[PDB]
Write a protein that binds this DNA or RNA. Sequence first.
RNA 1: AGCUCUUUCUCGAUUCUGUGGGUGGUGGUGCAUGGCCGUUCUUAGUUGGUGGAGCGAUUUGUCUGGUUAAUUCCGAUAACG
Length: 208
Amino acid sequence: SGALDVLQMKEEDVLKFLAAGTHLGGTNLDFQMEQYIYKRKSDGIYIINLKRTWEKLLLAARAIVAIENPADVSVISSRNTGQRAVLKFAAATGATPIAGRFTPGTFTNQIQAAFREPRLLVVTDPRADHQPLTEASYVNLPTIALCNTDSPLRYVDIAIPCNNKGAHSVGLMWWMLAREVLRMRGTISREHPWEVMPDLYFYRDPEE
RNA sequence: AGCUCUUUCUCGAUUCUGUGGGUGGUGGUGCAUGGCCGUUCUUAGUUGGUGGAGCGAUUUGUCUGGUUAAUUCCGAUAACG
């Protein structure tokens, strides 16, 4: 990766990726998502490479580190699956969540009381949260998000591929994201098991 | 009706007369106007701020749907209050 094997993907994490079905990706493709895919099966389903997922995780996370204030890396998700995941993210690591409906004009107003000026964004799924992306390009925000095979790239600077159609793929990926930023900034580093797990970043899932 | 005329007393600077200038008018103009009233209109309509969309006139907000006597609420939502 960069450093020889003290940042490179371990044998452990491979099991978690495959158990959460992150490697699988939808039938439809884009021409900006061609390189991330390796190939197709004998059936409609296209298998994302996990090596290529891993490199994109790192500089994405390293950019979340690079800011000197952790209270203005505003995360956003509006899908139900991505509500519980982001809430733990921005609770654990200093960040600002915007859960549910966006309520437009919150990055360009001077009258609204939910007005904020962050630096980064971390979005789940471009085609549920298209609204904050358009407003990001009016006030110079860097942008990161989780793309799928059929999610187009536009007003995003870096992608973090994932299966993310509402799965354990979602919560696992947000957990891993918060794990990495702590290895560089925090004192959680040792790279041997963290107390917090991905078993509460997964969906609410209506119970009995 | 001393209004006028005949008649011949009375009042005393308040006046009369000329010019300049006022004043009054249910005189005109409601197509010069104020105010008031009627009517469009007894229906549910109306507007600005900041942001968004347009070269602009403008538009969004002030709504597909459900609901109410009612722009009355629920809900939706590039609009928010």
